[PDB]
């Protein structure tokens, strides 16, 4: 529970915001079948034209103005266009003659919008957003969404909107957000249940972003699962944090190699979530902690590495703590949920374990180690027999395991593998549901004889096939050994370069997988 | 003084320095040429040139006031050498008492003007020839043109260059070192140049110190042992220190400078000398000097083809400047001036306790900035130190760094990078590069560039991700951390170690004395 | 003239954009004092801050429509700050009922903007103008600007506005600008000043970007010829026979591996009167640079990119047209620029080669990929037979300038003090930023070749900028001589396109001699 410190200046803990200004935003949603009304504020329409490649811009929504109304008349309104992710404003008065603020975003020409579409006009709808000083903003849906579109709507508009300062001291004056917002669309009252839902989603996004942007030196195994503690305290999680004592007498011998170069202590996190009624699945979620990789010995010093984005390596374990929260706060019913993460860190020091070293995992499985910088499967192993140890129907582990990644299906898509087809099944069902997209990988057991150690049991790597993320899956196989078990590789997705900021990757995904 | 950790009791626990060096037992003897040269004992050296004469012929213009050698130095011997910038020949002849003499030249080329390269290529012809002859005494005869300034910058790079570093022989102690005990010059109206002579004396050892600490490994040299020899040396110029621990800097504040050294184990170690005046003070200086006593790169690790990691331990060759400086200005003593020494020293190592690439670290004035890469040390050390010097209501703030391996790609290894926010502050070092001959050129802080430090999560980023222009970049990072005064950088990377020569060359030291004083 | 083909559809001239919508612009420049009228298209308010955190806006110029003036009141727009290159636009009707679009621009809280902040204005700027089908844009200069700026806000403005659809097959633009400013009878002057300097960056932008199979030794050749034709200017163009003839073993032997014949191209401009100073300007023109056997096949090489290899030549030869159309007096001036492409070939010239320059000098070649200093000699020394007063030779020399002055900042060595600061004044006034780099003596020494009388490059020195000014500095005896390097300048790499750099410094820098 205490922080080990190198000087006093070093922090003790993981700043985190759970109060989002998100949540301070009423939230609105009536029906576009009475007319919409355009008083304070930014009014913004969300139109197409479907089939016309650039078309006119048209209103179809009532308004309950007279002046509004005239102003937005087609004649007006075809000098604008259609195309995704264009917007414009507007300047007008009412029928009480106040003067209010009316636009619009493009959502192209295409009727049905993918989860792609759907975030470039939420990001160009947030661009809007900043460097405005509103009070309140209306968006009219004049386009065709299901409920689950139109989560992801709010989901991605409440993600994008939100800013994290909790590392800035010397700070954006002039943020200021929006305390209402409404919502007009048809059949409002389907809908309305999609709202909450998606605050909810929201967070545990957030949440998981916020453990992933904290940079190591924050955020480390004490730390991290004194967060998992303090989240768990707040949800009702039956919560438990395995120390070194525990872990050796549990024999994790491959989980305690990793972090035998750190100065920080390792910490298992076990959160529980038990439904009141009947009990009919129970699934274990894993994921992948450690809180930053150096590589080892195997350094990360070659071109590409990525050394100082490695604070990400712990998105698997922000994951699966973000749908902690989601799933505490939902309740859902007849299942229990074990949340798994083997946190560490993997670092170069006099009590670093070496490449060539041989390690026992607590299988009895004896492994011989090729490459340090290749840990996330070696802590994964040892909490996959912990897993399974707990009898459960489901075992499904998400990690940034894999350079690969970036190579097979690149930083939208993630991998998931598996020794199960319906359990892939239900988590490629979740993916499309979640709209966190993942593709589904094979592990090609023709690779499985390049992990034949001439003196372990097994190889940690292969120095043959440079399909790693097969290689690696083809590993993590080889420690469940009568369980329905799925693995998603992350590695790629996690982070948004472009964006300069994590994701939260997995949370949705994995929730929405629990709930369904 | 604080005590050297040891890993084993072999371990040294102090930089070895010499202090007095056969330099300093050298009587230096000003003669006016126009009473003529007398050759007697030892080696005696005619500086001679031939204007615009692409090698031309040896002229000795001098009277010598001895028949014999005068004879042999007659123009119809001598036409058959050459002045040829660098050539050096030997005489050997008898003189009017009977006695054996040794007379020569160097030559000093064509140009009327000599440049400081080509005066350090007469001098180290020179010294090749003091080396391997057991010489008591050297006489050289300027019949060249030089002013006060070259004239000294002669002395002083005959004296480093005279001088052999033999502090780590053991075995291998050169049995033939003998240096000569009595230096003689002949020049143009020497009662104006006998001033420059014990300037250069002091200017030369200044050099030699610095030189001194920059070449001592990093097992000898730490921010222990080096912070220690301030302190020494402190004591022996009657100069106000004061060694900050870990303890004082934490209440400081300074996470960056920490955040550096956590991961070696030796302490962190911040030197403050002050000289103060004993009249009235008109003028404030801060001196700021980069003192990493081993750069490993941290856990970005000096891994890379070219990256020099056994050169490491010039990584503090700005803080061996400004202690060099000290020494300088303590000895001179100039008045009406009060002046701090800093250096924030401490060492960037690899280990469980290291600061990660990524983290995110507070500096003393509260600007949070996040690590891209650990081999960018320097910066973060000097953030801390200018926020330190700022606090000590200076006029200027000069810091002086192996910052950037850029420099190596900009300005190359004999010219120094001078970077700042005030012209005049800037014109006053260039001023005094000119004037100490040691090379500065004006390099740009341009503001565009600053938009690449913006940090998503942080106030600012250590480094930038696109630029690669690292010189101009750190530039922009230090003067986030001065606020409200006259501020230069120099970049020492490229100049601070002589490659060919493989030692130092003490840079900075001259540049850094010759600001002060003639402020 | 004529170009060689491998195949039939390979292309065989450069296609240029002469008549640009930009032309087509009417530019009327008004007095803020009288008021604005909001009548059709954009109005863009240019505004600052001093002391700003950044700071709200405010508009402090009448405007004479009482719509816009409702909209511009100070309640309204403290919702908006004045961050640099922070816009917002609104579209509303005025008292005519007329459909007009409103907006500014934030200058930040300094009072004196600097060329990066002015052309972050502008981007700013003609990021509106891509997305609104505008027939009028009016801008309001609500910021102090001096004469030289304010002609650079449109040259930027001119040439960010303007889109390069030469090489789009398949598979606009505004009539009218007003500008309102104080003093508005000074400014005026500046404006086709900056028309002729927005087509001569932009000619040597379409000249750059041209792909080098469009841009080869014979069809730039063949561009500059036209060129000359349509500005009335002498021409010239040396072929392999002439060149031969004239000794130059070093330009002609990096171009022994092109199928393109090596073009030498010489124009002059003489003003019509009493000639007081000759100005010989040298422009780098590799139309591609493979970097022969000693193959950029290392990362980082950027080998992609090496059409920009004669950006020096396009800056002169966009020179050319400024200078051909201002007209400028007592003065003299000739471009050149040695072109050829530098290839793998069976007749590629090879590492170790020993070539003889035009005067004499022989040069052992220590890397193929150095081959622009080789080609500037032979130019050099065909330059200063020509008798100027001035030699400034412009090219893409070294990459080593990216870890020096960066992507902002070109380098000039010299010869001459004098015609150094004359460089940098030119600097000042055309905003193209340029910083004195020395020339180096104590390197000279790494030049010194075993066999041959110098060395192309150094075995060390990783000062390679220098170490080439030092090079090149041997090819100039007694001609006051500078040196432009512009490798890190001349290609905007978050943009996707050259800057067209160097031109309208060279062209100040003709005018105020
Ligand atoms: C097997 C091999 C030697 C190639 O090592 C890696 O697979 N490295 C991965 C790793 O270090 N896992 O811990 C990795 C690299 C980049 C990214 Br992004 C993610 C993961
Ligand atoms: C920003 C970057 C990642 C390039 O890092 C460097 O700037 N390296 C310098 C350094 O390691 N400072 O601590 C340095 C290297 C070589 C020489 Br010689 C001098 C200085
Ligand atoms: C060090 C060496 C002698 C090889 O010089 C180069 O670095 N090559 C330049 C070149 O190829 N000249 O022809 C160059 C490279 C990249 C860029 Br961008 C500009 C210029
Ligand atoms: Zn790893
Ligand atoms: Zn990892
Ligand atoms: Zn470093
Ligand atoms: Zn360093
Ligand atoms: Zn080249
Ligand atoms: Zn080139």
Redesign the interface.
């Known amino acids: 529970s205490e922080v080990p410190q190198?000087?006093?200046?070093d922090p003790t803990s993981i700043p985190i915001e759970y109060n989002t200004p998100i949540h301070d935003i009423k939230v609105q949603v009536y029906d576009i079948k009475g007319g919409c009304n355009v008083e304070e504020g930014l009014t913004i329409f969300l139109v197409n034209n479907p089939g016309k490649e650039n078309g006119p811009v048209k209103i179809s929504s009532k308004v309950n103005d007279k002046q509004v109304s005239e102003?937005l008349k087609d004649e007006?309104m075809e000098?604008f266009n259609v195309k995704l992710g264009?917007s414009?404003?507007?300047?007008?008065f009412n029928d009480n003659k106040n003067?209010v603020?009316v636009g619009y975003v493009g959502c192209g020409s295409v009727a049905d919008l993918s989860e792609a579409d759907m975030k470039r006009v939420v990001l160009s709808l947030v661009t809007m957003l900043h460097?405005?000083?509103?009070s309140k903003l209306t968006v009219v849906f004049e386009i065709n969404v299901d409920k689950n579109l139109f989560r992801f709507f709010l989901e991605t508009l409440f993600y994008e909107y939100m800013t994290?300062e909790?590392?800035?001291?010397?700070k954006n004056?002039?943020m200021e957000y929006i305390k209402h917002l409404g919502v007009y669309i048809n059949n409002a009252d389907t809908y309305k249940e999609e709202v909450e839902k998606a605050r909810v989603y929201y967070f545990g996004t957030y949440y998981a972003s916020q453990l992933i942007?904290a940079?190591?030196?924050?955020c480390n195994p004490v730390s991290l699962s004194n967060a998992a503690v303090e989240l768990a305290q707040k949800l009702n999680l039956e919560y438990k944090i395995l120390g070194v004592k525990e872990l050796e007498e549990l024999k994790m011998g491959a989980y305690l190699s990793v972090g035998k170069?750190?100065?920080y202590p390792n910490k298992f996190i076990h959160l529980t979530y038990k439904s009141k009624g009947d009990v009919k699945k129970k699934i274990a979620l894993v994921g992948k902690g450690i809180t930053?990789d150096?590589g080892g010995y195997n350094?990360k010093?070659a071109?590409g590495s990525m050394?100082?984005?490695?604070?990400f390596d712990m998105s698997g374990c922000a994951a699966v703590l973000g749908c902690a929260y989601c799933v505490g706060t939902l309740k859902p019913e007849n299942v229990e949920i074990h949340f798994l993460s083997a946190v560490c860190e993997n670092?170069?020091?006099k009590?670093?374990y070496r490449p060539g070293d041989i390690i026992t995992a607590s299988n009895g499985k004896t492994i011989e180690v090729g490459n340090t910088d290749a840990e996330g499967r070696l802590t994964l192993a040892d909490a996959l027999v912990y897993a399974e140890k707990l009898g459960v129907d489901y075992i499904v582990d998400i990690a940034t395991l894999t350079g690969a990644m970036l190579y097979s299906l690149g930083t939208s898509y993630a991998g998931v593998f598996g020794n199960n087809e319906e359990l892939i099944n239900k988590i490629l069902q979740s993916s499309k549901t979640s709209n966190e997209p993942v593709w589904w990988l094979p592990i090609i057991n023709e690779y499985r004889a390049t992990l034949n150690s001439k003196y372990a049991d097994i190889n940690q790597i292969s120095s043959s096939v440079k399909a790693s993320s097969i290689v690696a899956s083809l590993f993590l196989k080889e420690f469940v050994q009568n369980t329905a078990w799925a693995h998603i590789d992350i590695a790629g997705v996690s982070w948004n370069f472009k964006a300069?900021?994590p994701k939260g990757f997995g949370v949705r995904l994995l929730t929405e997988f629990v709930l369904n």
């Open positions: 190198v000087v006093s200046l102003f007006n000098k264009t414009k404003h507007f300047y007008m003067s603020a460097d405005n000083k509103l994290d909790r590392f800035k001291s010397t004056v002039n942007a940079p190591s030196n924050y170069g750190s100065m930053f150096s350094l010093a071109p050394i100082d984005l490695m604070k670092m170069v020091s009590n670093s300069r900021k």
